[PDB]
């Protein structure tokens, strides 16, 4: 739908954040709104294969298409597009990502904030699955959860970002033709996000197997991370149901949100 265009006179540049899949990431600011932005550029890789340049362009376009229709506080917003070099202008999220925050073991996130993070992400995914047709992220993991604030009283704590690691992926998606990724695949990945918030640990990090065996254990033997004994029964049930081997047993997000709110 509606995606405004912005020129260089409308954008102020600052620093270079990093390298992405199709180009560069930059920290900036709108001169109109004075609000801070993250800018993702498209760069065509120098030879890199002929077919590599095509998929780079098509991934950039896919991200534009997906982000331009999503409008929710728990999902990173696309403000606009730029042309000189093609660019996406997205809101900047100031407190890093969930993956890196959880690595700080000396400073555990307190329980009330953990619940806010769980609910925030659930709300974002609920919105995605309520679209027509339902939006599927297809790369849900803790590095793609951006942290707005760790204040338990903030309007928004977490945002879903970087719309698309077998330990995050639903069993029916592993080594499968991509169009087997239903919305229920995101629901499985969400269970693993809930697990990582709860424990501060990487999902499946308690196990070590060769890749073929690992996948077989997940797919055929229902191997899942161990939920701690002190986990609240209602949270345990949500996690367990969300990572069901059978995708149709993974709950609708209205149920997930209700259950999490009662924690």
Of residues 159, 163, 179, the one with CA closest to residue 65: 163
Tokens of 110: 């307190």
Technique used by the depositors: X-ray
Q: Catalytic residue at 33?
A: no
Tokens of 36: 């801070």
Task: Report how far residue 112's alpha carbon sits from residue 91's, in angstroms, rounded to the nearest whole number.
Answer: 26
* Contact between 91 and 75 (Cβ < 8 Å): no
Of residues 226, 228, 219, 227, the one with CA closest to residue 246: 219
How far, CA to CA in Å, does 233 sit from each of 153, 227, 253? 25, 10, 18
**Residue found under tokens 């259950």:** 259
Q: What is the DSSP letter of 74?
A: T
Q: Which domains does the chain have, with CATH numbers?
A: 1-94 (3.30.200.20), 95-263 (1.10.510.10)
Task: Report how far residue 137's alpha carbon sits from residue 233's, in angstroms, rounded to the nearest whole number.
Answer: 28
Tokens of 171: 């069993």
**Residue found under tokens 């100031």:** 94
Instruction: Tell me whether residue 114 is annotated as binding.
Output: no
Instruction: Tell me whether residue 40 is annotated as binding.
Output: yes
Q: How many CA atoms lie within 13 A of 29 on its CB side?
A: 8
**Residue found under tokens 């609000």:** 35
Q: What are phi and psi of 88, to 5 degrees?
A: -105, 130
Of residues 184, 181, 204, the one with CA closest to residue 192: 204
Of the chain, the end-to-end C-alpha distance in Å amounts to 37
Instruction: Tell me whether residue 17 is annotated as binding.
Output: yes
**Residue found under tokens 């409308």:** 10
Q: Which long-range contacts (CB under 8 A, 24 or more apart) does 12-21 make?
A: 13/39, 21/56, 21/59
Instruction: Count the neighbouring beta carbons within 10 Å of the beta carbon of residue 207.
Output: 15
The partner residues of 224 in beta bridges, in order of sequence, read none
Instruction: Tell me whether residue 19 is annotated as binding.
Output: yes
Instruction: Tell me whether residue 25 is annotated as binding.
Output: yes
DSSP string, 132-165: SSPP--S--SGGGEEES---TTSS--EEE-----
Q: Of residues 139, 151, 186, 205, which has the active-site annotation?
A: 139
Q: How many CA atoms lie within 13 A of 39 on its CB side?
A: 25
């Amino acid at each position: 739908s509606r995606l405004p265009t912005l020129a260089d006179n409308e954008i102020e540049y600052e620093k270079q954040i990093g390298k992405g899949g199709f180009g560069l990431v930059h920290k900036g600011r709108l001169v109109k709104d004075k609000s801070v932005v993250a800018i993702k550029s498209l760069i065509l890789g120098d030879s890199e294969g002929e077919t590599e340049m095509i998929e780079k362009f098509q991934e950039f376009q896919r991200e534009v298409f997906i982000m331009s229709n999503l409008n929710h506080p728990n999902i990173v917003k696309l403000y606009g597009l730029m042309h000189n070099p093609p660019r996406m202008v997205m809101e900047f999220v100031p407190c890093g990502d969930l993956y890196h925050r959880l690595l700080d073991k000396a400073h555990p996130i307190k329980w009330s904030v953990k619940l806010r993070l769980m609910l925030d992400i659930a709300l974002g995914i609920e919105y995605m699955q309520n679209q027509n047709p339902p939006i599927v992220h297809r790369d849900l993991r803790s590095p793609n959860i951006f942290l707005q604030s760790l204040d338990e009283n903030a309007p928004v704590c977490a945002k879903v970002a970087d719309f698309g690691n077998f330990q995050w992926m639903a069993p029916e998606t592993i080594g499968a033709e991509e169009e087997s990724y239903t919305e229920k695949a995101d629901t499985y990945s969400f269970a693993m996000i809930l697990y990582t918030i709860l424990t501060g640990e990487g999902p499946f990090d308690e196990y070590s197997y060769g890749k073929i065996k690992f996948i077989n254990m997940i797919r055929e033997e229902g191997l899942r991370p161990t939920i701690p004994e002190d986990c609240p029964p209602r949270l345990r049930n949500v996690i367990e149901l969300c990572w069901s081997g059978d995708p149709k047993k993974r709950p609708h997000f209205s149920y997930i949100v209700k259950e999490l709110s009662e924690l």
